[PDB]
Design a protein around this ligand. Sequence first.
Ligand SMILES: C[C@@]1(c2ccc(-c3nc4ccccc4c(=O)[nH]3)cc2)NC(=O)NC1=O
Ligand SMILES: [Zn+2]
Length: 208
Amino acid sequence: GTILIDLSPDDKEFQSVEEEMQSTVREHRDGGHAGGIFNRYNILKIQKVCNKKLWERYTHRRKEVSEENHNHANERMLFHGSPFVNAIIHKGFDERHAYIGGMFGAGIYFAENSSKSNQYVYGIGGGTGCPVHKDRSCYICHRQLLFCRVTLGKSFLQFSAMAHSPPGHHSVTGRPSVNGLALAEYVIYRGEQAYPEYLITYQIMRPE
Ligand SMILES: C[C@@]1(c2ccc(-c3nc4ccccc4c(=O)[nH]3)cc2)NC(=O)NC1=O
Ligand SMILES: [Zn+2]
């Protein structure tokens, strides 16, 4: 049931998604090991992901969360990197998309920094890099991220350097507590609390 609609680069919606992608790049404490060395991306395509059933599954869960949290879904737009983006956009998020060993427990993880989600496009720690060159810093191969609508509801705040969310909460917020430049990361424990709204195809760019 999924169809993908291409956005034109002249569309303000393409432009606002591209800007969130580019402006949330940061340096990583691994010096680029997982995700590659880059300061910006070459955006190749942005497609809107349209699936009525997945959308309705999302909004149904959003209303439940909202009603458990003084009518506040606490909805964000966040990045997700995964080897399974193609399954996600067709079938939705479920437990096979979870990071069992994540620092905040077995759930599905999202980032404010696009460059953080980039480190997972080829797997945990960037795996063995791109399929074609086995290069975690490949500048040639096309990568994809999702820019997702995520319901956080009442989020458990963890300060720091599938399971259940903590009792009385709908998600966990991993607040960065050492690296002053890192943005927050978030975990949900129900696939129905995220909708994969944009599929972004891109290359990382070699710095000049
Ligand atoms: C499905 C998978 C997976 C997928 C995505 C991520 C992921 N982890 C994150 C952790 C922090 C912030 C963003 C992300 C993010 O965008 N993606 C971690 C593990 N779990 C797994 O064991 N291997 C995987 O590739
Ligand atoms: Zn490659």
